[model samples]
Target: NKCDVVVVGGGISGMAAAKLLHDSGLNVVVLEARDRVGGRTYTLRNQKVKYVDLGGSYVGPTQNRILRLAKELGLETYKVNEVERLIHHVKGKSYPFRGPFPPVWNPITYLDHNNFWRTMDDMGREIPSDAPWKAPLAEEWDNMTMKELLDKLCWTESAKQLATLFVNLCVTAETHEVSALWFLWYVKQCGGTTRIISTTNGGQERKFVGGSGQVSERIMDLLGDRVKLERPVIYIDQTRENVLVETLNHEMYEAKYVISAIPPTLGMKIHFNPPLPMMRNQMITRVPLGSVIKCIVYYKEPFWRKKDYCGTMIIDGEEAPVAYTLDDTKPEGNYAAIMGFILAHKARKLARLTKEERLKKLCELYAKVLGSLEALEPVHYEEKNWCEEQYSGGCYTTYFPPGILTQYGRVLRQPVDRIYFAGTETATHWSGYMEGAVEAGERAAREILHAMGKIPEDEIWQSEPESVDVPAQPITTTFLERHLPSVPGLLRLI
Candidate 1:
């Protein structure tokens, strides 16, 4: 009936927080809305093949938190396959780029690309990732969407399209969906736009051996039966000092403190007895979820690897729904797989297509890029529309639109009385990744632990020392060329 803490939402963030609280000698109960935990990080295993991650999958350089947790759990990681060559497909043309920027394509394309990156770098430096709203130009930057930023600067059409795809690739969002301040903050958090968008040594650098879900699974295993699954909390009566939580099924509990470790959009659905602050109400609307549908294609063998291809494909101006594709083949394993993401506007539009049609379309796109008959007809195919989930309506996380970051971003990580927030979106670094989820969870737990006088104020979660720092690479001519060749807007060179 009562406990020291009640952690709502059994996802990685919730479970991680619950585990920390439990280990600290607090009586903690985790109420999961779904039948299982892992939250947004869902892994789909097909027979003896590799575990396909339909949710948050990658852990890259400088993401030390999640990596340390995995090591602590006795889990190992495998290097995600590096791209040897990138294939850029656009409007009936496929270009295999061995060098950065398409071969002397357009002079203005180069000028625009350079100008855009320089502007972004200048702006990114101005944003303090942890508290972007405090930046000098926060109000001005927050007032406009990334779309407005591009238009205001008169970015070339080619530059505009590439910038749009860049934004889409990062947060699974369109340019119009996020504020300029929010985008700059993201660039600051991930070190730079290049780091956020790169695959070789960047954000998508590595994967857990089994799957990302195993991180949560192993944590839950440690939690044992403390986690109550399928109990969706519909209301929280915090009128009293002790918080009262009631599930839709009438299950009730009392706790000294509560952590709502779910997406803000979904979390807003719960009825609060005293009601949340007006700013919180407005935040839920401003920070709408970004949409992404993940599709995993499997073949008996990694046929593309035999061709010395890494299976990294960036398709622009395509009628197909796929925006980005990467090689997800497990290391030292015979099975091969590719992870394709259908992003933003296309995700919803593609969801309406029949299964057969969708699969057919995917296969066609794969065949064109890989230049393989095997790709034209994959052996196994599985797709997940994050927009179609019950608890989570979107994937790859969400973002603040124009003006919202400055008005409501300040208190996102702050506690509202006894109610603490602990989702990836609330993370200071690598927000929307598995690392951020773990970071946020542990952070929320630490807040409660500090309040309980169990841990010192300065004592925070420690991780293995980072060997190398992820630098924000300057947008040199080569750098600009390599990216623009495959991005949308710039027509493929003949």
Candidate 2:
């Protein structure tokens, strides 16, 4: 088969690219390795709860690309119920807090906590979304791990533990395993620490009405027959004018350009005729996706709500199986569930246990935090360990270790001849979320369009709007509002 372009993946990124290319009058064909699409965004149908997302599910402000696509696909969104107090489990105790930050009894630790996040926010602002390695302190920050930074900044032992748990929960990796520069860059891309962690007007603000996976399914419906399943491209020979893409079954297709929309590590599985550049290969080797096991427990009713809790919990204890959790109940009020994340080192270690064992352990932890026996009596349980997935080595997105970004970050999105890269990792904004996936896919398609002389160079890096129309209540600006200065009449001076 011959086509104008060949997209090697059937995930959201690849599907989005194929849709746009086909709409632009290009003969595009998508070859997906798995029998299903959606990639990391998998929505499993459950008899009790209707549906539950085992992968990328949440979307919020500043994630305009995915929000726009959802609106275009006629999908709706609902706010995650964060009306009640959130539980902060630490050192065998549960502290109910009203806001994002957990309660610190020690005055010094409280001050240290505030200063730590403020310092991180300040440092993150110095990073450029497109090229983080260009920051003035990039070399110093990239050379150290986040654990080093936490040790240097945090004053008390409790403060240090809180920071470590936050980093583990956010990145799904240990603080020592991630570079300080990479963590700052990732947070900056999604706005700031406050916006990234908050459920109200933040990254975990809202979720799709049906499920995130349906976004890819809807796109597939539009591009019927253009996407082929169980067709993994194992070889690519770009020596000739037209690129030859050979699948595992020996099916060959000629195209002017090829868009590799899979993860960098997954791309290494394919054999390139001329081989990838040394820098690109080295970067891919250093960049590894974070490990995570997303678990969900279903109940007959919203029992946590009876105790006036929002069902959001942050666990700092080393013995707990999950580091974080949120209320995963459906918007229609017909289903009750709680979603938890078994992250980083814990995920690697816990995967050895059977799913039933993991479920029981998580339920015991939930029972302790919620202070209710209902947690132990779940009607259903579900989980997904991204590390074991063959096509996707892990979930969320890839991260850079020390020395990788500064040495080879330039080749992240740079096209290698007629082969272009498109994935969440390549996105400058919301790099680890579904929004970034769409941005990268659209951006890659625009690059191909520019090369074909079908569009101008300026259109290659198109910017998305800050907000889009969604079926939800208008967001309040109270989060962004600044407090008045102490100086009298300071506002008049401006």
Candidate 3:
């Protein structure tokens, strides 16, 4: 019911923070809105073979926190099959493509070779490997959207269509809404699709012997009975001694510290004692959640493999049902999974349709690029719609018509009064990836450590002394002229 630290949202950010806090001899209590943990890093086992990752399927090497932690936890990873002869379906046809491609599209597909790929490679190189968000690209292309960038580059009609297929790279949002700044940040952190194998894939991926849920369990087990499942904290009131948290069912729990680990949109809904400030209000208003549905179907067999297709598609038809991704099966054989990213508004607009109606439409879309939809027969399936859930309400975070991300995207992460905020959405590096969640947790832990007086003084931002000096170049120019009289032509001639 009470503890020294109260961590909110049982997702990665919360779990990681709680794990470290618990290990640090702090009494931390994690309050989750959901029943099960591992908010996004989920693994489903079914018919095909590999684990059916419901949320983020693959952890790129660029995602250092997760990749490194997995190894430290003795988890293994392998290189994903990157050479996809990937195709896009538009107007009843399949068009092939590959990435490490240019930011803009080539209208004539003829722009494919020479300089296009080379330029993209160049940009990817400029992007930093460790902390990419610190890049100044946001100011460089603030007004531009991903699609707008493609248009600016004068991409061909086909290239435009193919570029849209890279939506998966965006972590579940459409080009029209997501910021160009976010895209650039991804490139900076991910080191471009051009960056080769992140960690050595030990011939296979290292998943928890069971599922990602096992990792969550390990974290919670460390908490022992401190974690109460299904107890959602609906509101909080912070004080000098105790912070009161009330669930929707009117259950009240109190703690000295509360760290909000849920996405900003969800966290905003919970009541704050005197309401939040204009700064937080501005962020809460602008910090919107993107709707994405991670769908997994237990199928009769891995049917699309027969067509040499990996069950992935980029359809450009008017009535398209989002992309179809494959090879997301489990070794267990009871479940056949393929996770599809559908924005909330788009998915819900058609959620009421019957299974047959849905299939007919999906089939039509699939048939355009590949052959038939008959391969997608399912027995029973799970469609985890984050947008529909009132407590969590949406899959990931995004920046919109401008607020926090515009001005204080980084600043909002700073501690407000005694309250600290954290989540994958607010992560500094790899903000939208699972790596962001882990990164945020590490950041919050440092903050808490400082508050507890455990932080080293030299590491403190304020501890660094301020110094003012003339520009090094100017100083060097003046001193160099005075120190050495250059008799230029005295045997200096070529």
Candidate 4:
């Protein structure tokens, strides 16, 4: 093994790019394939209400830089308070949004998954809560589908089931063929009401004070022993001088500089020596990775936050396959958890059904929402399916249909040569969130410190990055009227 800068995938953009290339001195190593590090921000602490989430629960006190480095590693944040609002279901029927969750969120956030939330909420309000790549109709909503902009926005049938409960939380797909500018740049990087806008127990609402793996053990205690762990890599290649990096048991290593924050579909499972860039293998098949299925249910209390009920449940005969359900188990604690997000093509059409038919379609979608799924007593139920993970084969990264995020979204976060490409799908400010994986790991550690010239480019924002704030108001006509389902085809609203 060798090192001058290797950084494969340890997740939170290769552990914040091996802690900023080992404090910019650069001799960093890091090569994790899952012996764990906050990759999809994984966490699990439900020893029955001792309280702890199971994974990437939430963190958004201003687009969270790993929850502000877990509050500068002392850790503590909590305020995910959505007691209950945004309850729209479709194709069968169900609705219950009271109001003020963004001034009625809009012609009903995609009524029954038809107009794909009123055409990605009318071309996602033309992307400009703060520069959606300077949205001037961003090349015409990048070639349509939030159901052809909700059939040119002709909604009404209870606003199309009040807009599929906000396009079923910005997509795991199924709003009649997704991608209306990557679902309106995922509702303009989930501003307005809330999103993966986090802050769980480690930050409040669900709580993880001493857990959430303390930002992966204080970033493996500032990368001391070169951080290896069960190494999986399996060939990275990338040469110009170095970057070999193998390990599917056949351990091998070298690195003049190769910071592959992996998973742009893990480059079709490695071996890049002189073979990457057929437009990065057609931009990882024009946006792939969609097959989420996060489930966490443990309760003794938090019983609808003490029967006040907004733990949430938008049903219409939904007996648990999950059309909607987010109550994140916390009501002053007993370590509760109920995350369920499934719908990446209906959990890949139940992937040939049987884990008891996908937990009986998730206990019949939790007995159509907390009325009784065997009366809410899940001592402990856990699942984290990132679509049958072969190394995050899917889970976030579904945006790309009409000309793939506007023609290979300009090489995601470009690099290729010394092999670079950060995560949250190469974020450009909240691209997918975890504050777009810490702003694409500080833009791939400032493109490997400006290609090793060590930094300059106007000192890159005097070096301050972690984004997400610019929604003082402008979610348009009250944020898609509480879960979009009307307002498609106006083209350009970002």
| lDDT values for all models | 0.79, 0.87, 0.56, 0.60
Candidate 1 residue 66 Cα shift, in angstroms, is 0.8
TM-score of each: 0.91, 0.95, 0.77, 0.35
Count of backbone collisions within predicted model 3: 15
Candidate 4 lDDT, 410-451, residue by residue in tens: 776678777776776666545564556656776677777877
TM-score leader: 2
Range of the 10 consecutive residues with the lowest summed lDDT in candidate 3:
466-475
**Candidate 1 vs candidate 2, lDDT winner:** 2
Runs with alpha carbons beyond 4 Å of true place in candidate 2: 468-494
Residue 331 CA displacement from its true place in model 1, Å: 1.2
- Model 2, residue pairs in steric clash: none
Q: Count clashing residue pairs in model 2.
A: 0
Off by over 4 Å in 1: 48-50, 98-105, 460-464, 467-494
Candidate order by decreasing lDDT: 2, 1, 4, 3
- lDDT per residue, candidate 3, 1-494, as tens digits? 76777887777778888887787888888877677777766665554534555655455434557665454445554333323445556576676654323222332353432222333344445544333334456455545676676565423555555455454334455666655555555544544434421212211122333455555656776677777678777788864467788887667877766788877766566878867777776676666666666665556665555556555555553356666444445444335444455543456665777656665555455455557565445555555556666655566545443212446455557675656777776665567666678777767766776787878744432211111110111101134222332122212542
Which one is best on lDDT? 2
What's model 3's TM-score?
A: 0.77
Cα lDDT tens digits, model 2, 372-418, are 89999988889999999889889777877776787778889999899
